[PDB]
Amino acid sequence: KSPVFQFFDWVLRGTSQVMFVNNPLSGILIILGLFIQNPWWAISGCLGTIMSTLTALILSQDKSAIAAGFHGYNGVLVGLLMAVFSDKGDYYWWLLLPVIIMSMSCPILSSALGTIFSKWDLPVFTLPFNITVTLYLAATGHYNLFFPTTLLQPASAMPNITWSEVQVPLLLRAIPVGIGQVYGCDNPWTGGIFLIALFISSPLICLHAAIGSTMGMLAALTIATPFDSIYFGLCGFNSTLACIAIGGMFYVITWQTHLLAIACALFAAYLGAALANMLSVFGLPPCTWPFCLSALTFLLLTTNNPAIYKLPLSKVTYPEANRIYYLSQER
Amino acid sequence: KSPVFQFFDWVLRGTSQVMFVNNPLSGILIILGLFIQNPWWAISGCLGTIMSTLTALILSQDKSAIAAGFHGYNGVLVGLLMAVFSDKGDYYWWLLLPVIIMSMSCPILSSALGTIFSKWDLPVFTLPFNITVTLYLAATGHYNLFFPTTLLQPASAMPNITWSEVQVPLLLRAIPVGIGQVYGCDNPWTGGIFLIALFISSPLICLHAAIGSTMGMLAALTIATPFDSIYFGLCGFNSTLACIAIGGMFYVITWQTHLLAIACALFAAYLGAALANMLSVFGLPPCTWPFCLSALTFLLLTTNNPAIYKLPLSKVTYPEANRIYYLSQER
Amino acid sequence: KSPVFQFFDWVLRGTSQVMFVNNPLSGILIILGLFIQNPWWAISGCLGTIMSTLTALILSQDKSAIAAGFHGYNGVLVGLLMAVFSDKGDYYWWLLLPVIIMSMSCPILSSALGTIFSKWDLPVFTLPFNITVTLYLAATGHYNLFFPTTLLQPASAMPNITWSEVQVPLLLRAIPVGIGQVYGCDNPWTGGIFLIALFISSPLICLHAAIGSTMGMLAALTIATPFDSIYFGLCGFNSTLACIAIGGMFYVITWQTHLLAIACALFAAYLGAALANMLSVFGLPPCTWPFCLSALTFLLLTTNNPAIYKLPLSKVTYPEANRIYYLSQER
Numbered sequence: 003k004s005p006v007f008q009f010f011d012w013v014l015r016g017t018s019q020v021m022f023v024n025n026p027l028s029g030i031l032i033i034l035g036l037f038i039q040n041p042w043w044a045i046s047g048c049l050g051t052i053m054s055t056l057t058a059l060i061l062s063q064d065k066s067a068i069a070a071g072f073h074g075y076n077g078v079l080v081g082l083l084m085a086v087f088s089d090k091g092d093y094y095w096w097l098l099l100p101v102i103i104m105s106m107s108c109p110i111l112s113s114a115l116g117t118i119f120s121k122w123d124l125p126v127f128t129l130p131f132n133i134t135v136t137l138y139l140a141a142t143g144h145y146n147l148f149f150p151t152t153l154l155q156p157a158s159a160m161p162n163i164t165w166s167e168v169q170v171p172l173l174l175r176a177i178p179v180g181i182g183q184v185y186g187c188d189n190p191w192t193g194g195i196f197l198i199a200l201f202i203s204s205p206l207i208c209l210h211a212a213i214g215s216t217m218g219m220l221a222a223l224t225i226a227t228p229f230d231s232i233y234f235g236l237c238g239f240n241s242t243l244a245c246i247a248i249g250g251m252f253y254v255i256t257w258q259t260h261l262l263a264i265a266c267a268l269f270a271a272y273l274g275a276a277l278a279n280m281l282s283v284f285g286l287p288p289c290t291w292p293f294c295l296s297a298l299t300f301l302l303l304t305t306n307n308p309a310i311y312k313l314p315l316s317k318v319t320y321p322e323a324n325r326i327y328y329l330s331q332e333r
Numbered sequence: 334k335s336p337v338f339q340f341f342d343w344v345l346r347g348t349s350q351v352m353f354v355n356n357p358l359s360g361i362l363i364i365l366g367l368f369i370q371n372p373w374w375a376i377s378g379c380l381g382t383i384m385s386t387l388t389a390l391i392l393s394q395d396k397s398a399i400a401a402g403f404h405g406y407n408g409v410l411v412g413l414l415m416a417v418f419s420d421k422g423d424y425y426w427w428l429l430l431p432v433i434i435m436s437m438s439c440p441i442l443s444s445a446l447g448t449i450f451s452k453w454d455l456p457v458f459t460l461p462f463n464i465t466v467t468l469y470l471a472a473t474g475h476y477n478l479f480f481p482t483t484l485l486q487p488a489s490a491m492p493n494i495t496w497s498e499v500q501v502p503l504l505l506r507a508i509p510v511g512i513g514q515v516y517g518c519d520n521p522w523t524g525g526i527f528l529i530a531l532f533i534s535s536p537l538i539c540l541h542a543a544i545g546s547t548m549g550m551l552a553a554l555t556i557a558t559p560f561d562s563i564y565f566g567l568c569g570f571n572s573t574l575a576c577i578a579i580g581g582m583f584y585v586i587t588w589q590t591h592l593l594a595i596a597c598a599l600f601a602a603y604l605g606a607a608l609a610n611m612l613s614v615f616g617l618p619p620c621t622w623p624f625c626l627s628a629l630t631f632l633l634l635t636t637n638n639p640a641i642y643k644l645p646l647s648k649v650t651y652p653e654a655n656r657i658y659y660l661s662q663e664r
Numbered sequence: 665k666s667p668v669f670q671f672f673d674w675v676l677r678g679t680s681q682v683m684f685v686n687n688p689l690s691g692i693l694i695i696l697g698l699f700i701q702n703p704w705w706a707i708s709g710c711l712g713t714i715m716s717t718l719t720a721l722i723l724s725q726d727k728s729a730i731a732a733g734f735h736g737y738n739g740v741l742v743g744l745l746m747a748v749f750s751d752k753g754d755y756y757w758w759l760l761l762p763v764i765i766m767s768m769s770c771p772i773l774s775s776a777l778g779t780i781f782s783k784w785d786l787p788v789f790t791l792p793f794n795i796t797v798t799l800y801l802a803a804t805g806h807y808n809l810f811f812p813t814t815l816l817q818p819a820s821a822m823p824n825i826t827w828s829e830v831q832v833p834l835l836l837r838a839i840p841v842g843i844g845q846v847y848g849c850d851n852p853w854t855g856g857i858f859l860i861a862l863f864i865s866s867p868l869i870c871l872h873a874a875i876g877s878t879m880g881m882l883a884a885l886t887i888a889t890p891f892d893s894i895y896f897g898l899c900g901f902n903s904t905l906a907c908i909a910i911g912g913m914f915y916v917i918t919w920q921t922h923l924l925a926i927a928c929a930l931f932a933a934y935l936g937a938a939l940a941n942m943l944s945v946f947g948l949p950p951c952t953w954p955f956c957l958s959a960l961t962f963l964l965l966t967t968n969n970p971a972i973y974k975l976p977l978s979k980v981t982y983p984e985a986n987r988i989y990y991l992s993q994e995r
């Protein structure tokens with residue numbers, strides 16, 4: 003195939019690696035979902051992925067890592083979440099100038115954290131996106147002349163919650179919306195598209211995504227989160243990412259590991275509330291910080307029983323193949 | 334003995350492991366002190382210890398670690414410091430619902446940090462409690478509908494300190510109160526009870542606790558801390574914990590190590606002031622963060638002279654036995 | 665030579681090691697620059713260096729490290745930046761009391777971080793100064809009775825920038841001022857003196873310092889930084905330090921490494937804006953935090969091509985000798 007087609011294949015795998023799937027068709031579906039939700043965000047995310055993969059090539063990173071989309075999955079989130087939190091509205095073309103530059107900083111961090119994490123056979127997952135986007139949103143801020151960001155300020159009043167006005171249909175619809183909020187999209191249709199794309203590659207990832215999103219919603223209800231945040235899906239994207247990560251990918255899937263994944267989703271939801279309340283002091287949002295922190299603290303956990311088995315990163319692919327390999331190695 | 338008696342022995346050792354003592358009688362004395370100060374806080378702390386040890390058993394952690402109370406010493410602090418910082422007052426039974434849940438997160442972190450720290454033969458001491466309680470207090474906050482917390486806000490005015498109104502008797506009484514503030518208790522009687530419990534196991538721990546508390550008070554006076562904070566003992570619990578840790582436990586006790594412990598107590602007091610001023614921006618208090626940070630930065634210190642000897646964690650028990658073992662190994 | 669002369673030689677090398685030069689004459693020039701800018705700041709910095717080296721001797725640190733000034737280069741910054749951010753004005757002699765004490769905490773941290781960093785052959789450069797000065801400025805704060813600090817508060821209004829009023833001469837003069845801002849000095853003459861001192865030891869360090877300062881200024885212009893910050897040099901000292909570090913010292917100097925250094929300078933400038941906006945919430949300034957973070961994240965970067973070569977710390981001296989050694993080893 004032509005090198006351009008290979009590069010676009012890498013970009014398509016990267017845009018889907020956010021949800022822990024390496025599949026070009028799922029990447030196409032996710033791109034279609036992003037364009038369904040907001041074309042400007044899709045353009046910004048595609049530019050972020052392209053520039054992140056180009057910087058990975060320029061910095062002479064491992065070709066296998068680039069071909070698997072391990073470097074493009076942070077540029078998409080950087081571009082999408084810098085277009086989401088822009089106060090200048092849609093099609094502010096100047097926003098593409100930082101979207102490029104900060105995307106170039108994703109492979110660098112991706113490499114740096116790797117050097118830190120290879121000591122513990124620990125994955126650095128979406129952590130560079132968090133650092134890069136926190137850097138950008140703090141550098142610019144809401145009071146910037148060129149690239150202002152939306153205003154986030156800490157809660158200063160007791161919320162008015164009427165539990166007789168809760169809508170169970172929207173509370174359930176927060177599951178696909180929570181799935182879609184991983185990329186920053188709040189449209190229910192793009193959330194359903196993301197669920198379909200997850201199911202194409204591996205059904206276990208889709209099941210764990212739905213379970214993580216519903217656990218994030220349930221954990222948000224238990225601390226009296228305002229219903230607007232829950233309906234918007236803002237309370238269940240760290241949880242779905244954590245449930246996907248600990249569910250059957252980085253651990254061999256088992257009922258013990260399923261319960262561990264549910265516990266990690268709950269912990270990620272509570273850490274998401276904590277970090278949303280803390281980072282909002284600086285005006286910054288919780289952008290996948292809770293997922294990274296909780297997934298790291300649940301992958302470093304050492305447990306004696308043989309059911310909770312952590313796979314070497316070299317052999318992690320997708321949960322069903324992970325289980326097949328584990329049984330092949332045991333026998 | 335019956336398994337229930339063994340479990341309660343583990344809980345009693347855990348409730349005393351906060352002050353670095355593994356002794357069921359000292360645990361009983363500390364529980365009696367907590368009940369003397371506030372029965373509700375004692376109930377919350379006991380529930381925290383019970384659920385932390387139960388989660389350690391469920392997660393199939395090392396049985397020797399559980400039997401020594403290495404997992405129950407974080408649940409007690411989580412429960413106590415979540416009951417202390419509750420705005421709903423005494424006997425708010427719903428507060429036991431998070432006290433359980435967050436306690437379950439203490440062994441997990443305890444394991445995770447262990448995996449991080451075993452590379453440097455470094456102890457993770459009370460660090461999970463800090464993370465868990467900071468998570469809870471940030472997630473809920475003072476403006477929560479269900480579990481509101483007490484309001485902490487950064488200093489915005491120059492304090493009015495009259496040095497002619499300082500009370501030397503209360504300034505001295507801040508030593509036992511500073512000892513008792515480790516568990517969150519401000520009663521002088523429970524501080525004296527804690528000192529007695531420390532002396533039961535090993536006199537060196539009691540001496541280093543008193544020295545650390547008085548160093549925290551003295552260091553707080555040097556930066557013009559308001560006398561109300563000093564009298565309340567809020568300025569000398571990180572210092573006493575750091576002095577206990579570096580005094581004769583994790584280092585072999587020597588006059589060089591005694592001076593190192595005093596320096597660590599001073600550094601922990603100053604870091605406590607810094608973190609109390611910084612974390613109060615988010616509304617969070619300094620909950621043993623300074624002790625952990627200063628003890629880590631004083632245990633990683635490399636010093637050429639043979640007097641400052643750091644013991645492998647496998648053989649740290651209590652300062653007198655530590656010294657006896659060190660002389661046995663040298664000769 | 666007499667031991668006093670040896671100790672003052674160590675102090676002179678330490679006061680210049682901030683800019684990554686080990687040369688007593690450059691140390692004398694830098695001290696002369698500090699006295700040119702403000703004699704009180706020079707006295708505070710000299711006391712900081714003296715007490716940091718004395719604590720390094722007391723704590724029985726490596727004599728080769730002390731002789732090379734590897735321990736005095738943090739006391740100078742601690743003293744200088746605690747005298748800079750004092751609200752009591754010039755010749756407040758009581759300020760020397762903490763300048764001593766916090767200086768004693770520089771070797772300790774210097775050792776501790778070393779134990780953390782030797783696993784990755786990673787340098788701890790100016791990181792203890794950041795921790796110590798952040799500790800001091802947070803503990804005291806602007807509302808302290810004894811040692812108040814200057815008030816820094818987050819931006820709460822959109823800045824009024826008139827691009828027709830920009831002064832190219834001052835914008836260029838921000839290069840030597842940016843060089844001098846490493847020590848906290850804003851005088852153009854002391855910046856020129858620092859550039860001369862850098863050129864005495866090794867011209868590559870001077871060139872990379874100027875390039876880093878101009879990259880910091882250019883990166884500050886791109887996010888609409890107020891011109892007062894740029895003219896003052898506050899936007900280009902982290903950048904010049906990062907450019908010096910990654911330029912030819914810790915990497916073998918090459919055009920690939922030159923571009924890497926320029927990229928690191930840009931990243932350090934943007935991280936400096938981010939941390940200036942974030943830390944100002946607590947009232948703290950960005951004091952070489954961006955340099956440390958960006959230099960660490962660019963020294964952990966793993967790159968396949970042989971041009972980007974990282975030197976073992978044992979053999980890093982100065983960029984020209986680094987290149988000479990690398991070619992000697994290759995052939």
Ligand SMILES: COc1ccc(C)cc1S(=O)(=O)Nc1ccc(Cl)c(N2CCCS2(=O)=O)c1
Nearest residue numbers: 019022067072073112125126127128315318319
């Ligand atoms: C979706 O994220 C993941 C999904 C699945 C795997 C196997 C890991 C990750 S990750 O979290 O570690 N991200 C990430 C970023 C950059 C590189 Cl270079 C890599 N890898 C290169 C080869 C081995 S690797 O360690 O897989 C992973």
Ligand SMILES: COc1ccc(C)cc1S(=O)(=O)Nc1ccc(Cl)c(N2CCCS2(=O)=O)c1
Nearest residue numbers: 350353398403404443456457458459646649650
């Ligand atoms: C009071 O805290 C301490 C007092 C005395 C010792 C020997 C350590 C600690 S600690 O700070 O490291 N906490 C802690 C938490 C969980 C476990 Cl599993 C353990 N340990 C299991 C066995 C070896 S261990 O490393 O002792 C220690």
Ligand SMILES: COc1ccc(C)cc1S(=O)(=O)Nc1ccc(Cl)c(N2CCCS2(=O)=O)c1
Nearest residue numbers: 681684729734735774787788789790977980981
């Ligand atoms: C200007 O800073 C640097 C410039 C040049 C070198 C070789 C490192 C540094 S540094 O950033 O690592 N600081 C620093 C602080 C304390 C000590 Cl003890 C040391 N070192 C002792 C000997 C080997 S070492 O690792 O060089 C370095």
